[PDB]
Symmetry: D2
Subunit: 237 residues, 4 copies
């Protein structure tokens, strides 16, 4: 059904579906079983920043995640996205909770896509930046439990009044406009995404994670993708 | 019905509805009878560039139109757009032909909107740039006769095979995503639009013009707005 | 000697040289006696953000200053900068202390200048953004007491070890590259500057202020411009 | 003496110093003998566009060169620039002619450098874009025979009145401000450069080429680097 390319900030180690034994960042190409992962020293309650970059010349999707005053984690994977995704895609953020939970709060999100064609000076670009989300954010498609406006933030999963994260929740936010990532006369296509997040859990084992993803434009949350599936995959294959 | 704020590049002088006796650029606030105009030395067959700028501190909508090697024309009008438009709008380009005609070709179009809130570093921004239009431009809403892809250009009004402009045509192209132009904690909201166009007519009296407009998100072409109404207004009041 | 256009965030009311009886933001065109001012509810110890904008079509220099959770202050003045400044200028930040003092800390500073010429697609642009200053910031010209690197910030005036602001201090930081603000074939020239600051004083009467300024490229601090002259003017005329 | 990293658009095959037997694009790390090259179908008299990209996560310097209506050439090389260049560098364009010659005209040049630190939202950026060069371009350091302003272009090597390219010429243009390409708390540093050029020769064997380069800030043209050395290297080792 959906084609998903995602960079996951996986807070819970589901070693039975291939997660390493620690929080990790991973690159998922059409499967929750990451093609590549890197240990991530996740800090409960701290605001982190994730940067994702890719260009069609190098064909390497790379991500860097850091927290202030801490060393960063980085993961890269060689993948030609022209062979995985459609030429028009939607980009978004997804997060879930299962039996274990955490807040999956997004405080800001920026994205820049550029397609440079062979005509002298031909650049097609799309750029958006959100440093605040309003209750009626018309340029975002919110799916599942995702809501905007509480403290001007984007809450991907359900958080009750007293700020408590709820389990078995899943939510996604996609930018409204389709994004053009391939065009026949493009000599270089590239994108960069950055988002700051705040994962906080009352528990010692937060779950399940946040993911930046690119999908077919009409992507919707797969049935039963709460928990370990991060609101992105229908199963764990 | 629709709320329209537009900068018109009016090629035909309809002196009966208030046009001056020459091609002119004008600022239209909810009426085709421009609030302010400036003589425009339109060059048939040449690529021109229009720049439109506005910010909520000064509340002055200004536009500059020029052709290479020629002096520019500029028009400005003091208007608080927060009092005219909704907080979420769609931006687009419109053009029409009537008994007289011309090609209303758009070769590139860029737009940048910024909302800076009172939180330190809070900037919400939207930027798009098209230097080429493809046959299936999914991020544009084409209305009426507007088509994309012929020579990688956006043809707002009908042009037959042999490149001839057709009369009684009207077409509009709006960027897919809603644009947020006001927010309660924004200290300064601004936008700038730039587009290059090519108006060419076999006739000595081209008509009717191209307009950059901002409207309510659900705006559609008014019935009978071909010709002098530029695909923007239902009547000439 | 120097030609100075500045937006002052004046913390001390020197009513004898024309200041209003309160902290105020003002637009200074070649004189410390502001052409226009607006009351500024300055917050000692809080990080504020100032936005300055200008374009050659409207010829209005406007500035907005705000603090989180507080209403902003704005001041505007109609001035054609082509008639005041040279075509090549340097942009900077200046601050001073006199008998009264305060820290004049800059935490981030961004600037964007654009010159759009009448050739189709001719845009000359300069943009810089500093969200951190290093001890050896080679792209900034530091004058007087200005230093970079302490807490990754730019300290315009002297602050001793224990964080205490020192009196009779003056310092300026200018971006290294000259900025082109006028060109003969430019149809619209514009700029926007934004900087966040932290003015903190142990005293009830902080002084003297911070100013964003544009000057001739070879501008240097005028002798005796500590205190009320903000490191910009040689006298109070 | 100087540390040079350059992307060369080499028009003349000096097979004795390792050039392939055809025009080629190459990546030169401290030597004119390119670490990697790719055949380049150079078009005499046509305006081409070169794009150079690099980021510190992937550590791969890649370049794409194209002409309208033609397939592009691309070359990439894995190199960690933090191990080759200083943290502060100057970026520029260089070109030369020897016994054979060609015009080495630059019509536009843009550059964007970004350093993203681990503090949430810490981005330091520098961006410049020139779509026109004036006779007194104060923000460019012209070395050797390089001149600005003729037809609003940048002529890297000497061209006599009648538009004829002169042999044994060498010229370079560097952006005035130093560029910061590494910082201790940066999690990702990246840059992208784009320039359009017009290489035209009356002869069947144009020479010698144009190069985009990054060097130590105080770099100057090496003595005798006309011809095959592209105004970048003192010898052919
Ligand atoms: Ca997991
Ligand atoms: Ca008319
Ligand atoms: Ca004062
Ligand atoms: Ca060679
Ligand atoms: Co995982
Ligand atoms: Co009219
Ligand atoms: Co004052
Ligand atoms: Co070579």
């Amino acid at each position: 059904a959906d084609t998903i390319v995602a960079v996951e900030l996986d807070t819970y180690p589901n070693t039975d579906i291939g997660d390493p034994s620690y929080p990790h960042i991973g690159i998922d190409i059409k499967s929750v079983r990451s093609k590549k992962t890197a240990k991530w020293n996740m800090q409960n309650g701290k605001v982190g920043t994730a940067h994702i970059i890719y260009n069609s010349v190098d064909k390497r999707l790379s991500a860097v995640v850091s927290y202030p005053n801490a060393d960063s984690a980085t993961v890269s994977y060689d993948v030609d996205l022209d062979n995985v995704l459609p030429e028009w895609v939607r980009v978004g953020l997804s997060a879930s909770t299962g039996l274990y939970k955490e807040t999956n709060t997004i405080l800001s999100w920026s994205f820049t896509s550029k397609l440079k064609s062979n005509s002298t000076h031909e650049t097609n670009a799309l750029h958006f930046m959100f440093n605040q989300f309003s209750k009626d954010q018309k340029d975002l498609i919110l799916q599942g439990d995702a809501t905007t406006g509480t403290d001007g933030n984007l809450e991907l999963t359900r958080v009750s009044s007293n700020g408590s994260p709820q389990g078995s929740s899943v939510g996604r936010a996609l930018f409204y406009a389709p994004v053009h990532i391939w065009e026949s006369s493009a000599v270089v296509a590239s994108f960069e995404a950055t988002f700051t997040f705040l994962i906080k859990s009352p528990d010692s084992h937060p779950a399940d994670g946040i993911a930046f993803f690119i999908s077919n434009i009409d992507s919707s949350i797969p049935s039963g993708s709460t928990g370990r599936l991060l609101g992105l995959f229908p199963d764990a294959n």
